[PDB]
Short mmCIF file of C-alpha atoms (C1' of nucleotides) in Angstrom, two decimals:
data_model
loop_
_atom_site.label_atom_id
_atom_site.label_comp_id
_atom_site.label_asym_id
_atom_site.label_seq_id
_atom_site.Cartn_x
_atom_site.Cartn_y
_atom_site.Cartn_z
CA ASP A 257 96.74 116.85 145.71
CA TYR A 258 98.00 113.26 143.77
CA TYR A 259 101.13 111.31 144.17
CA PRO A 260 101.22 108.97 141.53
CA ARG A 261 104.02 106.83 142.25
CA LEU A 262 102.10 105.63 146.33
CA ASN A 263 98.97 105.97 144.24
CA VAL A 264 97.42 108.07 147.03
CA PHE A 265 95.71 111.52 147.29
CA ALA A 266 97.06 113.78 149.80
CA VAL A 267 96.07 116.25 152.03
CA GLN A 268 98.63 119.06 153.38
CA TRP A 269 97.59 121.71 155.88
CA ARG A 270 99.52 123.85 158.63
CA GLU A 271 98.06 122.89 162.14
CA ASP A 272 99.97 125.11 164.92
CA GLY A 273 103.02 126.24 162.74
CA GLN A 274 103.49 122.36 161.84
CA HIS A 275 103.38 120.87 158.53
CA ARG A 276 101.08 118.12 158.18
CA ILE A 277 99.87 115.66 155.68
CA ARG A 278 97.50 112.75 155.56
CA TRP A 279 97.25 110.06 152.69
CA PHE A 280 94.23 108.92 151.44
CA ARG A 281 94.93 105.36 149.02
CA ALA A 282 93.28 105.59 145.48
CA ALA A 283 93.16 101.56 145.04
CA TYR A 284 89.78 101.45 146.73
CA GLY A 285 88.62 104.16 143.70
CA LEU A 286 89.72 107.05 142.84
CA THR A 287 86.92 109.45 143.04
CA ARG A 288 86.06 107.79 146.75
CA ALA A 289 89.80 108.68 147.48
CA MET A 290 89.48 111.85 146.16
CA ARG A 291 86.29 113.15 147.64
CA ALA A 292 87.27 111.30 151.53
CA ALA A 293 90.39 113.63 151.40
CA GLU A 294 88.12 117.18 150.28
CA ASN A 295 85.79 116.06 152.97
CA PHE A 296 88.84 115.61 155.51
CA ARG A 297 90.26 118.62 154.85
CA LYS A 298 86.92 120.73 154.87
CA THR A 299 86.15 118.81 158.29
CA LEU A 300 89.29 120.46 159.25
CA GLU A 301 88.77 123.58 158.11
CA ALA A 302 85.32 123.42 160.15
CA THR A 303 86.66 121.99 163.33
CA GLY A 304 89.79 125.16 163.07
CA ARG A 305 93.02 122.83 162.71
CA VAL A 306 93.80 124.76 159.54
CA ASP A 307 95.72 127.94 160.89
CA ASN A 308 94.59 130.37 157.98
CA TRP A 309 90.72 129.01 158.03
CA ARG A 310 90.42 129.50 161.61
CA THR A 311 87.98 131.68 163.14
CA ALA A 312 87.53 134.06 165.89
CA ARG A 313 85.70 131.39 168.12
CA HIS A 314 88.73 128.74 167.15
CA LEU A 315 91.43 131.33 168.27
CA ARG A 316 89.30 132.06 171.56
CA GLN A 317 89.25 128.14 172.66
CA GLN A 318 92.80 127.37 171.20
CA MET A 319 93.98 130.43 173.60
CA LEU A 320 92.82 128.40 176.63
CA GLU A 321 95.42 125.42 176.07
CA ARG A 322 98.13 127.81 175.37
CA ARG A 323 97.65 129.81 178.84
CA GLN A 324 97.91 126.39 180.49
CA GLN A 325 101.31 125.59 178.57
CA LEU A 326 102.57 128.72 179.14
CA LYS A 327 101.70 128.80 183.07
CA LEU A 328 103.22 125.42 182.97
CA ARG A 329 106.62 127.10 181.01
CA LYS A 330 106.08 130.52 183.91
CA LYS A 331 106.54 127.89 186.45
CA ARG A 332 109.09 126.17 184.88
CA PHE A 333 111.36 129.23 184.77
CA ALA A 334 110.24 130.87 187.79
CA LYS A 335 113.58 131.15 189.41
CA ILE A 336 114.92 133.18 186.61
CA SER A 337 112.59 135.68 186.38
CA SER A 338 112.66 136.93 189.84
CA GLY A 339 116.38 137.51 190.83
CA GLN A 340 117.23 134.52 192.09
CA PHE A 341 119.69 132.01 191.28
"C1'" G B 1 220.66 41.64 146.34
"C1'" U B 2 215.16 46.89 151.40
"C1'" U B 3 212.22 53.95 147.87
"C1'" G B 4 207.00 53.12 145.62
"C1'" G B 5 205.18 56.64 143.17
"C1'" U B 6 202.94 58.67 138.35
"C1'" A B 7 198.64 59.08 135.05
"C1'" U B 8 193.99 56.76 132.95
"C1'" G B 9 189.24 54.07 132.90
"C1'" A B 10 185.44 52.77 136.03
"C1'" U B 11 181.89 54.94 140.68
"C1'" C B 12 180.10 58.69 143.87
"C1'" U B 13 179.07 63.59 144.84
"C1'" C B 14 181.26 63.03 150.44
"C1'" A B 15 181.55 72.14 152.92
"C1'" A B 16 183.28 70.99 143.68
"C1'" A B 17 180.50 73.81 140.55
"C1'" G B 18 177.43 81.21 137.31
"C1'" U B 19 172.36 74.98 137.84
"C1'" A B 20 173.39 70.55 142.17
"C1'" C B 21 167.35 65.30 143.47
"C1'" C B 22 162.52 67.77 141.30
"C1'" A B 23 157.68 70.85 142.59
"C1'" G B 24 156.73 75.41 145.39
"C1'" A B 25 155.88 81.81 148.99
"C1'" A B 26 154.74 85.97 150.82
"C1'" G B 27 157.67 89.52 148.14
"C1'" C B 28 162.54 92.77 145.99
"C1'" C B 29 164.57 95.31 141.74
"C1'" A B 30 164.57 97.19 135.98
"C1'" U B 31 161.68 98.05 131.60
"C1'" G B 32 156.83 99.38 129.79
"C1'" U B 33 150.64 98.99 129.39
"C1'" G B 34 146.93 101.07 131.52
"C1'" A B 35 142.81 107.34 133.93
"C1'" U B 36 137.59 103.70 128.46
"C1'" C B 37 136.14 100.97 135.54
"C1'" U B 38 137.63 104.30 139.51
"C1'" A B 39 139.16 109.94 142.43
"C1'" U B 40 140.15 114.44 141.40
"C1'" A B 41 132.44 119.87 141.67
"C1'" U B 42 133.52 117.82 133.86
"C1'" A B 43 139.71 123.48 134.44
"C1'" G B 44 133.23 125.80 128.83
"C1'" U B 45 137.53 123.32 123.46
"C1'" A B 46 132.19 121.40 124.42
"C1'" U B 47 127.42 120.11 127.24
"C1'" A B 48 121.81 118.86 128.94
"C1'" A B 49 117.70 117.84 132.83
"C1'" C B 50 114.35 118.76 137.31
"C1'" G B 51 105.85 117.04 135.65
"C1'" G B 52 103.08 119.66 140.70
"C1'" G B 53 101.24 121.34 145.50
"C1'" A B 54 101.14 124.07 150.59
"C1'" C B 55 99.27 132.14 151.97
"C1'" A B 56 106.38 127.72 152.67
"C1'" U B 57 107.52 132.74 149.88
"C1'" U B 58 115.11 135.44 146.32
"C1'" A B 59 115.25 129.74 150.62
"C1'" G B 60 122.31 124.70 150.52
"C1'" A B 61 112.87 125.79 153.11
"C1'" C B 62 108.71 121.53 153.26
"C1'" C B 63 105.52 117.09 150.93
"C1'" G B 64 106.18 114.29 146.90
"C1'" A B 65 107.04 112.31 140.95
"C1'" A B 66 111.02 111.88 137.13
"C1'" C B 67 116.22 112.17 137.61
"C1'" C B 68 120.07 110.61 141.85
"C1'" U B 69 120.44 107.31 145.23
"C1'" G B 70 118.63 102.13 148.75
"C1'" C B 71 116.71 101.68 155.86
"C1'" G B 72 114.97 97.09 157.34
"C1'" A B 73 112.65 93.14 156.63
"C1'" U B 74 112.62 87.68 152.91
"C1'" A B 75 114.24 84.96 149.29
"C1'" G B 76 118.50 84.48 146.88
"C1'" A B 77 123.39 83.82 148.78
"C1'" U B 78 126.42 75.68 143.14
"C1'" A B 79 121.30 83.83 141.94
"C1'" A B 80 116.92 85.75 137.27
"C1'" A B 81 121.52 89.05 138.90
"C1'" U B 82 129.39 89.18 141.39
"C1'" A B 83 125.41 92.34 144.43
"C1'" U B 84 119.52 91.77 142.51
"C1'" A B 85 114.18 91.21 142.90
"C1'" U B 86 109.01 94.12 146.55
"C1'" C B 87 107.58 98.04 149.72
"C1'" U B 88 105.96 104.80 152.76
"C1'" U B 89 114.79 104.03 151.38
#
RNA sequence: GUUGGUAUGAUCUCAAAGUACCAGAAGCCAUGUGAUCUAUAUAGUAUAACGGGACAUUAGACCGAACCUGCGAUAGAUAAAUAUAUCUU
């Protein structure tokens, strides 16, 4: 998208539920800024940092760190699931 | 051939005066003037504005123009302006 008051091209996407935006100043050139924004968006899509465009490989790869964080949480709240406390 | 009082002119203001050498308070009371600034969603007798985007999707939801509004920094602060000028307010 284009923000005219700021004179920037913005890329807005969603990554892990969060809504994220990045700016690309157009003073360096309208075509250059727009193409930089498009290239950044396509790089995010390819690397799997946009949720709706992810592939099975990206989901599998992200599930590993998801599992690590979930195990940390489980150890955090271990004493409740066992029946003590 | 043993009374010294009575009234006025001047002068002064000495616990004289509806003024008391002059200037000078915040404030009190009476009668009026202000809802064109400002508070009360402008009580429809009246009345308009909000370009776009993300699989956000009936939202006191998100990023952002117009519009409403202005964190902090700098200057100004006998101003360009009695409150502004620049910017991701």
